[PDB]
Amino acid sequence: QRDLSVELGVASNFAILAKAGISSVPDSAILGDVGASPITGAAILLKCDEVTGTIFSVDAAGPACKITDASRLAAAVANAETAYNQAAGFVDPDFLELGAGELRDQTLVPGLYKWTSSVSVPTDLTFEGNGDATWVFQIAGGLSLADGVAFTLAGGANSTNIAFQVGDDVTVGKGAHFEGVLLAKRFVTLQTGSSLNGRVLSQTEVALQKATVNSP
């Protein structure tokens, strides 16, 4: 019933945005632009061939394919932080402490979900709602997807309408599949063979291990 859309601004061109760096155990496959700011481009530890899109840097450091664009990066990072704060700021949750932070065999209707703990996803998780519906997760801890688990979209639910605001480190397990916009306050790890349809916008560092990120 409720409008929980999160404005990304210029961060909507980025598959991965970080403040403190990005690394990959190769080969990962990143479909979209990547960048970090305010850290030097030397902290982008990705091969040019892993990114189908542009690797941006705020400075003259980075690999030979990098494009220096301090203004575009700084805007994306600022927009990403505003997005995080927007997501965190929605009031009056529809769900509070669902599953006491464990989402086992769950199917979630659209709405605002809040936890004061970390959240773990030990099984596939289904989102059921139409193409206009929105979901926001407010997590005042970490987020973990167990190895192999998949976020499943039903009803017409779209990954551009799912946002996770996570106050501590995020771990996507080996071969797990994430859907949505990940607004991470801290570290994000995508373990061996994991995939994500959406974007990863971190206020610290992102680590990929032979992972796939497909941005809209």
Side-chain angles (χ1 to χ4, degrees), residues 34-36 38-45 55-69 73:
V34 307
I39 197 165
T40 176
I44 300 137
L45 305 187
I55 297 176
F56 287 100
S57 173
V58 315
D59 67 2
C65 70
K66 73 102 185 89
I67 295 296
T68 302
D69 196 342
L73 274 171

Side-chain angles (χ1 to χ4, degrees), residues 24-103:
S24 171
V25 179
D27 291 310
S28 295
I30 301 160
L31 300 301
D33 294 337
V34 307
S37 174
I39 197 165
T40 176
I44 300 137
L45 305 187
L46 295 173
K47 298 157 89 206
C48 289
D49 68 30
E50 295 180 286
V51 176
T52 298
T54 297
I55 297 176
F56 287 100
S57 173
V58 315
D59 67 2
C65 70
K66 73 102 185 89
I67 295 296
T68 302
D69 196 342
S71 72
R72 175 172 149 102
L73 274 171
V77 167
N79 299 169
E81 175 155 3
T82 299
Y84 182 99
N85 292 332
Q86 188 185 11
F90 294 118
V91 308
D92 204 352
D94 301 297
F95 301 84
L96 182 55
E97 318 304 0
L98 181 53
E102 180 180 86
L103 299 175

Side-chain angles (χ1 to χ4, degrees), residues 143 145 149-151 162 164 170 172 176-182 190 194-199:
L143 175 65
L145 274 64
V149 305
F151 287 17
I162 301 168
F164 281 75
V170 179
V172 178
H177 179 67
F178 191 101
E179 291 277 351
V181 178
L182 179 58
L190 264 55
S194 60
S195 59
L196 184 147
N197 283 342
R199 314 174 187 288

Side-chain angles (χ1 to χ4, degrees), residues 62-155:
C65 70
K66 73 102 185 89
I67 295 296
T68 302
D69 196 342
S71 72
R72 175 172 149 102
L73 274 171
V77 167
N79 299 169
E81 175 155 3
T82 299
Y84 182 99
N85 292 332
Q86 188 185 11
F90 294 118
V91 308
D92 204 352
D94 301 297
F95 301 84
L96 182 55
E97 318 304 0
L98 181 53
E102 180 180 86
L103 299 175
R104 184 169 295 281
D105 200 39
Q106 292 283 356
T107 295
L108 301 185
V109 302
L112 183 58
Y113 294 75
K114 182 177 174 84
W115 289 266
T116 59
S117 67
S118 308
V119 171
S120 60
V121 187
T123 69
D124 290 352
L125 172 63
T126 303
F127 297 75
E128 182 82 72
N130 65 30
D132 300 332
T134 52
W135 292 251
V136 172
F137 302 75
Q138 303 175 317
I139 301 169
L143 175 65
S144 301
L145 274 64
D147 294 354
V149 305
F151 287 17
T152 303
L153 306 189

